[PDB]
């Protein structure tokens, strides 16, 4: 009652003070400073490889750390590991819950992870003396669909679920070590820092949060969007990230200064993004729209510099290798394509 | 087979075997009927599952040599618009609703009753952008207790703009008409209705008939004849 009202007023005045502090630190925009440099020419990218064999909608993909192998997951009920240079299939793993929504490749190449809409995150072991791929671990404890899973190291993993909660898991024991709470709506994506000490999460409440792996508490919050946050990714420097919403708009957020840096949007686009990535030098932001094709943005002037239109249905997943060699996009027509 | 070495021509054979397995395992998931089961909670879903019994919940049964796989999603409690497009290619939606609850009001909101909640959910799931060519098999449940409940207290409480003789067969027909009047497509969607109260071998036959009709139409429109 009285305490409730007084604490809500206190929260409101903290919000006002934080807004004033954020306003006082704004004196120039990215566009004004970047008005000096010169633009890059229009980018022409040609489909080199086409990867086929999935029989249903593809929902996630991840690149290996050697930039030659990748893994793809679809509602077909299979998880496939490819060879980009040659277009071969190395492994094809079945699944118990055909309602898969994520996939992840370990940074050492030993394990993979899969999960979604079944409340369980499964860890598969690829290098066995018996010659096949078998489930190494089966983490349970969420109360909502898994929407992201990223390997922190060879024996840790961070997951985000549809019950407004992120969780850190030790794969050996199988029990949560830390639980991150504070989101109001379903959490849709997360991305890890280059040093694997921080990560960011983006949820269905039009807000993003910067967590802390060690101490397990929220540190900083970023608002500004108007709909879901379907995708999120760090800048290679590790001091910024890019949010891809569902209102046909992308944004660049800065960590050291809690501000909106610059907005990517065009009036001919009325449909929301489903995937976001950067380039090795941090000059190109690739965004996967659901108007059947991808887009490339010059991430320092906010002007389009090419279109990767080669897909027949919605574009769901998208990723760039560790050395900037290629870019792979997957889509709901059950196809994957590599551009240079 | 000219540039490749001796350790690059066994990988190709391995990939061919993988492809063979993927293609041979994808002709078994297209020969079965996928049904999506929906309801209003304590509206007879459990008993309808029991009658035709052999996160997300799964069921698998067979009748007249036709594999039915039935998905129940009543334990999710997530945001429905973030996972409802996964069930885009389902053959039909089985909607179980009980008509012995027109007087019993919902516990959460004392103002409104459960029949209105069922009508809102039916309207929301019958006009969604992903289900414009998916048929709805509608089950009306617990008609035993309805007969003794209607005589004590009429259905005018649930339907204020009603005028009738307060008999069983009328009232049932009026409720059936009220539920099928919520459809807004009428050209790419048909609603099948049925009355059941713990009856055996009738529900499965009705489901089989509706599925056969849906399959016949979907076959007719793949050659243009439809």
């Amino acid at each position, epitope marked *: 009652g009285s305490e409730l009202d007084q604490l809500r007023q206190e929260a409101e005045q903290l919000k006002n003070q934080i807004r004033d502090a954020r306003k006082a630190c704004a004196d120039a925009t990215l566009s004004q400073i970047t008005n000096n440099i010169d633009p890059v020419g229009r980018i022409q990218m040609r489909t080199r490889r086409t990867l086929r064999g999935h029989l249903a909608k593809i929902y996630a993909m991840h690149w290996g750390t050697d930039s030659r192998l990748l893994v793809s997951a679809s509602q077909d009920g299979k998880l496939i590991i490819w060879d980009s240079y040659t277009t071969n299939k190395v492994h094809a793993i079945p699944l118990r819950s055909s309602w898969v929504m994520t996939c992840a490749y370990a940074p050492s190449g030993n394990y993979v992870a899969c999960g979604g809409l079944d409340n369980i995150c499964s860890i598969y072991n690829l290098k066995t003396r*018996e010659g096949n791929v078998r489930v190494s671990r089966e983490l349970a404890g969420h109360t909502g669909y898994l929407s992201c899973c990223r390997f922190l190291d060879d024996n840790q993993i961070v997951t985000s679920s549809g019950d407004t909660t992120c969780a850190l898991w030790d794969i050996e024991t199988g029990q949560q070590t830390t639980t991150f709470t504070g989101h109001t709506g379903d959490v849709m994506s997360l991305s890890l820092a280059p040093d694997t000490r921080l990560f960011v999460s983006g949820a269905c409440d039009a807000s993003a949060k910067l967590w802390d792996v060690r101490e397990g508490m929220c540190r900083q919050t970023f608002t500004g969007h108007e709909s879901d946050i379907n995708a999120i990714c760090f800048f290679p420097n590790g001091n910024a990230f890019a949010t891809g919403s569902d209102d046909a708009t992308c944004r660049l957020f800065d960590l050291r200064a809690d501000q909106e840096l610059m907005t990517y949007s065009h009036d001919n686009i009325i449909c929301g993004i489903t995937s976001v990535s950067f380039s090795k030098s941090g000059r190109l932001l690739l965004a996967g729209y659901d108007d059947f094709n991808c887009n490339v943005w010059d991430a320092l002037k906010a002007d389009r510099a090419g279109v990767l239109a080669g897909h027949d249905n919605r574009v769901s997943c998208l990723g760039v290798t560790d050395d900037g060699m290629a870019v792979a996009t997957g889509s709901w027509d059950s196809f994957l394509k590599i551009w240079n | 087979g000219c540039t490749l070495s*001796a350790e690059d021509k066994a990988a190709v*054979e391995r990939s061919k075997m993988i492809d063979r397995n993927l293609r041979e395992d994808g002709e078994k998931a297209a020969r079965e009927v996928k049904l999506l089961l929906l309801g209003a909670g304590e509206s007879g879903k459990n008993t309808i599952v029991k009658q035709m019994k052999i996160g997300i919940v799964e069921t698998h049964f067979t009748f007249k040599d036709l594999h039915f796989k039935m998905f129940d999603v009543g334990a999710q409690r997530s945001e429905r618009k973030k996972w409802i497009h996964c069930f885009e290619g389902v053959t039909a939606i089985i909607f179980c609703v009980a008509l012995s609850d027109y007087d019993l009001v919902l516990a959460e909101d004392e103002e409104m009753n459960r029949m209105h909640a069922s009508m809102k959910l039916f309207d929301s799931i019958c006009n969604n952008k992903w289900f414009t060519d998916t048929s709805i098999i509608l089950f009306l449940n617990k008609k035993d207790l309805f007969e003794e409940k209607i005589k004590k207290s009429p259905l005018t409480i649930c339907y204020p703009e009603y005028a009738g003789s307060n008999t069983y067969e009328e009232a049932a027909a009026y409720i059936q008409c009220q539920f099928e009047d919520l459809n807004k497509r009428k050209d790419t969607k048909e609603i099948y209705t049925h009355f059941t109260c713990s009856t055996d071998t009738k529900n499965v036959q009705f489901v089989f008939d509706a599925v056969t009709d849906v399959i016949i139409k979907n076959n007719l429109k793949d050659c243009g004849l439809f």
Partner: single-chain antibody
Amino acid sequence: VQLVESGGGLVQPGGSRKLSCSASGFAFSSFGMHWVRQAPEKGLEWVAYISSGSGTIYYADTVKGRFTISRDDPKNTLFLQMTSLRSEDTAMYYCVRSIYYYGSSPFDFWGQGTTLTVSSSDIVMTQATSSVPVTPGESVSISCRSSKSLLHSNGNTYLYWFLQRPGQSPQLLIYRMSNLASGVPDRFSGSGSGTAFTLTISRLEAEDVGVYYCMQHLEYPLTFGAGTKLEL
């Protein structure tokens, strides 16, 4: 994981035989299989190879049309059928598994093999060394030389090194002259280029005495080197 061979024994000069190995502990249906023979007090040479799916079969020019390889996949068994026999067929036969995909390591587990006594263009891979006396605690080197380059366009060079201790079956040490097999100490290393390759041991224990073999896998037939022996 284990393979058990059986079928060997004394045979008449002109006759047949059938050797079978049973493989328990792994997925026999996805593993290519080779036979490998070793004559008494000679080096070990290669015989035949059958692939996953039983599609492709390769023989040696010495036994082509006289040996037959077959695979009973449901019951996890591998057969070799020996049709016509001569005195130079006496050996010990081993059965080696090998699985080929990007990044694998063929010739992992070597089996144990059965004896066999009978009554009575190609690459050239050479080990001019015959024996290397050595005391424990000091580094040792072994050299191998080919007749044409083993370096392919893709950059992968198909040189294999592995060791047979006295009284046991050999075990893979190094594949593609650089990669180290799983389950061996980091003391061993391999290097070289073009046609000249060298294997090195940094710290010498008393368990490393044996014979070392270098093999190429550019193209069938696979030619084994001679025996380079170490003493204490």
